[PDB]
From Swiss-Prot, chains A, B:
A Pfam entry, by short name: Flavin_Reduct
Example GO molecular function: FMN binding
Co-factor(s): FMN
Annotated protein name in UniProt: Uncharacterized protein PH0856
């Protein structure tokens, strides 16, 4: 991470590996995508999600402007596009990305066709905790690839993406361990 | 999930598989542990984390009472204890759990010796989003197993735990994919 004055392991790496998602924001010619690890569910009913976004991201400006975002779930197969989303800045990066933008069902921000799922969100809160804003979004729509979630649970063959450390990513083992 | 009136896939399953952690709360005879998937990092500097906890959890009462919690990172090896933490209620469950409580460095809430890491947190915010409270904690200490994070990144041999769907868990593949 940049801004690490005391060299060593960022305390945050203790929570890793973390799932990696894509955050889509803006619409029209302003459409943007960035990578995000710091995403979680914050409510079951209603379904509400949250994402920590640094004010320096173009995505931050676009979420503030439009009050909407989409969480798109990438597979290992689109890692090159995830890397571009997580390294290049602003809407001009899309012309380097293999992904196709498609209309969302409820929000104006588009979805990514290649994504395993697209979760459409309306911002209901934004709080500043340290050096990121935690954008909290009510889920107002979603789409997904049926094979990625067949029988109502994630299908581990779909190669869900996780981030280990800076440029290193993994997927999950297919061997399921049963707790009961 | 219980409280699902319209049968089908909970929208939240679109974010799965998610990492599973343990949340320790209380101290002394009031010490408790529950499982939690809905945990993320919300700030790099200072290091701040957040966890979504339903008001019905004993953990919720204990975090509210003491203003502190610990995020303990479990491996696949302690899955039986994770399952007990995520199914039984309150401090009496610990006598069914294989884990050992040890003192934390900065908070009063104890750490788990068997955990890959223990992240000690002081509550700085608590917001109610739908049916959970998002407890936001400033990190004031941490400990970890050196082999689990050798060379400053997670060691995938340590068998970090992820949750697929209700009773099903996985770990990560050891094959690392490089983005650059
Ligand atoms: C795997 C990965 C995960 C990332 N996670 C986050 C995150 O959770 N929050 C954040 O603000 N930035 C995160 N970043 C950084 C942004 O994706 C990166 O700064 C991006 O260039 C922002 O582009 P934008 O300026 O077009 O919004 C991540 C980067 C990568 C590669
Ligand atoms: C794998 C797993 C993950 C869970 N994640 C959460 C969570 O993120 N937030 C939450 O409030 N409950 C979560 N639960 C439910 C609690 O762990 C469960 O209700 C537990 O019995 C609470 O115990 P307590 O009443 O002693 O706090 C999870 C359960 C499991 C099995």
């Amino acid at each position: 991470h940049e801004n690490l004055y005391f060299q060593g392991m960022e305390g945050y790496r203790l929570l890793y590996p973390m799932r990696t998602y894509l955050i889509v924001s803006g619409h029209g010619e302003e459409t943007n995508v960035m990578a995000a690890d710091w995403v979680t569910v914050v409510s079951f009913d209603p379904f509400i999600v949250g994402v920590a976004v640094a004010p320096k991201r173009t995505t931050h400006k676009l979420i503030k402007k439009y009050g909407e975002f989409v969480i798109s779930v990438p597979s290992l197969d689109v890692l090159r596009d995830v890397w571009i989303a997580g390294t290049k800045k602003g809407p001009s990066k899309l012309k380097e990305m293999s992904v196709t933008l498609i209309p969302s069902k409820k929000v104006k921000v588009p979805s990514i066709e290649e994504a395993l799922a697209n979760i459409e969100c309306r911002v209901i809160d934004a709080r500043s905790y340290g050096d990121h804003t935690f954008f909290v979004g009510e889920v107002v729509g979603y789409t997904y690839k049926d094979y990625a979630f067949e029988k109502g649970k994630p299908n581990l063959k779909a190669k869900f993406l996780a981030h280990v450390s800076w440029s290193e990513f993994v997927t999950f083992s297919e061997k399921v361990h049963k707790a009961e």
